[PDB]
């Protein structure tokens, strides 16, 4: 079962962001050959996510996501037990030290505003600060907070252009699209 | 036909750079064995951009120099489409996240009046911030906005003079000079 | 002898801070193997400070653990007939270049407030620095200045916390904890 | 001919630097394994200058030393055509972009005052800005300009000591102050 997509994948992003996203997906029993837009998701989330992550001040972020999740979770609960936040009902991908408070970061292929009202009412942690970027440049963020200054930000939503149009010059662009 | 100016190229450029610039011919399809001027102009040119891009605060630039033309093109396509900047005409060296433009960046062995008259009458794209560098320590930059702070530029300045240096000891000057 | 916290204290820590510790040990006549507890305590420490000495601007801070006691002093000498610092009864940590003193930090699975109390009773440097932290996130610093600002120090307590729970995941932690 | 003082230096300074020591004496025709007391000092200076063009921002100082005369040479030119500084009379050590201006650095095992004498009345390039280092502690700068803040200064005063107390830990001291 050989995709198209999977050989993509492998070409347009770093090795070991797709090794990470593959520890993942065994992590929840999902398999890259076959889940190969989810494989791309979790890819583009990946490289967002350790963007954003160098956007901030040194030590300023703490990296919950590209862990396993019994450690992911050990790392939130240090966090919780030395801060004083509140565990989050879901599992954040950032924590910020300058803010204090835990980011939960959102890529879609579809209007930041209903991706972001989705996820406010799934997680509803309410600390929890959420940030929705596009595959076309918007982003939303929790309190018109967006976390980073401007050029940070830029920098992710044009790699996520970029993405979009490699997808695009090979048609992959529709399915993946058409599969969130 | 192995020529002076292609080794000496070879031994006063980082081999990467030497690689981009090879590329950069290719993708033209010009020779850096027969257009050894061109060559060397590119090479200076390459490592002029990088130390520029280098000059910023972290996250600053986006090289859009040494990448073959259809991804060159592609990061220009989303940057254009993630700011709502207008696509240039012709491809741009950089661009200013801080700033919010594009830099054509140049590198001349005359004045560097006339050689920026030529490049603004020639891409007239308004908004493509244009800077020009001389192998004499002149600079030229559109309304007066040099982008960099003093040091940079005066580190762009001084590597110039050193290959113009280099050129003359090895008598390469004089027909370099007189190509452009 | 091989001890379940011998194998845990490696896989948890970089092998340069277990080589450290080694050395330490030795630099003591202690042994790892035998002294397992005192073995995890030692890499911690060497983390923490090596958190701390990072969490500076450049050039602030000199480390002075890990290194071997005839330098370690070698070192504290320099310091002090540079600066006119008096000489510390006991080796420092470290050295802070911008508030011009040493820096003893300590670690304990106690109260901060006891094991404070008994460091301070015992050097009595006066100008010398303390600063405890705690594997449930509190910190005690002399005269209530705390050197790092708030993100580096709450990284070290977030990773004392995480130390804390590998321990106790392997049943370690209470041997541990009634081992000081 | 094989000194305590060769090996001393081959164990004290970085093999880099120890390189470039040695042929810094190649390029004036002296050799490093009988002017020992002179490859140390040679290794010390260069040390030093590194550490000094270390403390500034980034792209702030041209490193001088530790090029080949000729190159040395090359730079200063190409530093003097594109600022408009005067050319020193002997090769400088440095060049500050920020403040424009050339830095002649000594180390010495005397008093500070009278070196300082010695170079300003030898160079006399005025423009040119004199820092002396002792291995004491005690610094002294044109103008009373130290050019770098204070953590930069103490750090190249703390590494002077401790090679002073190496030295003299193996008796290798006495000679090296009473050869300058
Ligand atoms: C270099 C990277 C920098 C950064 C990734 C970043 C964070 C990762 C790796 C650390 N890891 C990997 C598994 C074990 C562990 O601790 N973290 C930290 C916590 C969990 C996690 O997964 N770090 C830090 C160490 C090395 C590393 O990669 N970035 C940013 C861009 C993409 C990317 O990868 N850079 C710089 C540019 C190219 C690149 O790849
Ligand atoms: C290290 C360099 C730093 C810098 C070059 C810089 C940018 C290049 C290389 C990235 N590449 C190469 C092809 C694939 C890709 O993504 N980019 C970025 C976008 C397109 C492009 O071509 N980067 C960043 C990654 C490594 C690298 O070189 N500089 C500045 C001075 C000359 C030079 O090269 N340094 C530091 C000093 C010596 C050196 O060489
Ligand atoms: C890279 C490290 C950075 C840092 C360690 C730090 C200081 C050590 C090593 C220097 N040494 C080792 C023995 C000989 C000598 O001079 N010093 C300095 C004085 C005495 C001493 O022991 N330095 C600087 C040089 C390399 C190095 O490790 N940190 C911080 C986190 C844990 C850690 O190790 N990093 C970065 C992240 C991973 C890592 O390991
Ligand atoms: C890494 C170093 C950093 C620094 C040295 C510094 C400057 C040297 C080397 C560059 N070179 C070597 C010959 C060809 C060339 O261009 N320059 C620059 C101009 C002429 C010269 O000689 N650079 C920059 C490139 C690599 C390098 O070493 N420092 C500071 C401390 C001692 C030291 O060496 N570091 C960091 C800590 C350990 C170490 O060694
Ligand atoms: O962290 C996430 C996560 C996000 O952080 C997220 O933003 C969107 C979606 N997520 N999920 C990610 C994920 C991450 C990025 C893009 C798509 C997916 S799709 C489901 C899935 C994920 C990981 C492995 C796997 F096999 C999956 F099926 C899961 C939710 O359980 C916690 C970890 N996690
Ligand atoms: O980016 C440039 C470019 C510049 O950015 C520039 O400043 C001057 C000149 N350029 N041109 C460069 C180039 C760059 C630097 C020095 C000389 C040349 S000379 C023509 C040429 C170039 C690349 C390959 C090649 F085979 C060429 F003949 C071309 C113009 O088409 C877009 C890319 N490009
Ligand atoms: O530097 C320290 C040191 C500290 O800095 C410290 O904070 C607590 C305790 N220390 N001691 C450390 C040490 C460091 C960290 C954690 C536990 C121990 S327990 C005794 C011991 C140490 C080193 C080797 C060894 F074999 C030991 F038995 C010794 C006191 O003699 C100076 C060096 N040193
Ligand atoms: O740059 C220096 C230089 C200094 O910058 C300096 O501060 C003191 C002394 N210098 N001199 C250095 C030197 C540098 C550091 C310590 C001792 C010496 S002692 C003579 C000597 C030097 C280099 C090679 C050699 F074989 C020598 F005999 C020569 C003076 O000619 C320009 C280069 N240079
Ligand atoms: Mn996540
Ligand atoms: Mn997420
Ligand atoms: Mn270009
Ligand atoms: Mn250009
Ligand atoms: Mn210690
Ligand atoms: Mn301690
Ligand atoms: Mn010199
Ligand atoms: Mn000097």
Same mark, same amino acid.
């Given at each position: 079962?050989?995709?198209?997509?999977?050989?993509?994948?492998?070409?347009?992003?770093?090795?070991?962001?797709?090794?990470?996203?593959?520890?993942?997906?065994?992590?929840?029993?999902?398999?890259?050959?076959?889940?190969?837009?989810?494989?791309?998701?979790?890819?583009?989330?990946?490289?967002?996510?350790?963007?954003?992550?160098?956007?901030?001040?040194?030590?300023?972020?703490?990296?919950? +996501?590209?862990?396993?999740? *019994?450690?992911?979770?050990?790392?939130?609960?240090? &966090?919780?037990?030395? $801060? /004083?936040? %509140?565990?989050?009902?879901?599992?954040?991908?950032?924590?910020?030290?300058?803010?204090?408070?835990?980011?939960?970061?959102?890529?879609?292929?579809?209007?930041?505003?209903?991706?972001?009202? +989705?996820?406010?009412?799934? *997680?509803?942690?309410?600390?929890?600060?959420?940030? &929705?970027?596009?595959? $076309? /440049?918007? %982003?939303?963020?929790?309190?018109?907070?967006?976390?980073?200054?401007?050029?940070?930000?830029?920098?992710?939503?044009?790699?996520?252009?970029?993405?979009?149009?490699?997808?695009?010059?090979?048609?992959?662009?529709?399915?993946?699209?058409?599969?969130?």
């Amino acid at each position: 079962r050989g995709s198209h997509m999977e050989d993509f994948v492998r070409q347009c992003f770093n090795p070991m962001i797709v090794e990470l996203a593959e520890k993942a997906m065994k992590e929840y029993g999902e398999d890259p050959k076959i889940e190969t837009n989810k494989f791309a998701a979790i890819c583009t989330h990946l490289e967002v996510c350790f963007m954003y992550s160098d956007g901030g001040s040194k030590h300023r972020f703490e990296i919950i +996501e590209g862990r396993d999740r *019994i450690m992911a979770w050990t790392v939130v609960n240090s &966090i919780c037990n030395t $801060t /004083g936040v %509140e565990k989050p009902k879901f599992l954040p991908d950032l924590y910020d030290y300058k803010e204090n408070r835990f980011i939960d970061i959102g890529v879609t292929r579809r209007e930041v505003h209903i991706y972001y009202l +989705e996820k406010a009412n799934k *997680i509803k942690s309410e600390k929890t600060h959420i940030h &929705i970027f596009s595959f $076309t /440049g918007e %982003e939303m963020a929790t309190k018109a907070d967006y976390t980073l200054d401007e050029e940070s930000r830029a920098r992710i939503k044009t790699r996520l252009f970029t993405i979009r149009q490699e997808m695009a010059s090979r048609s992959l662009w529709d399915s993946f699209r058409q599969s969130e």
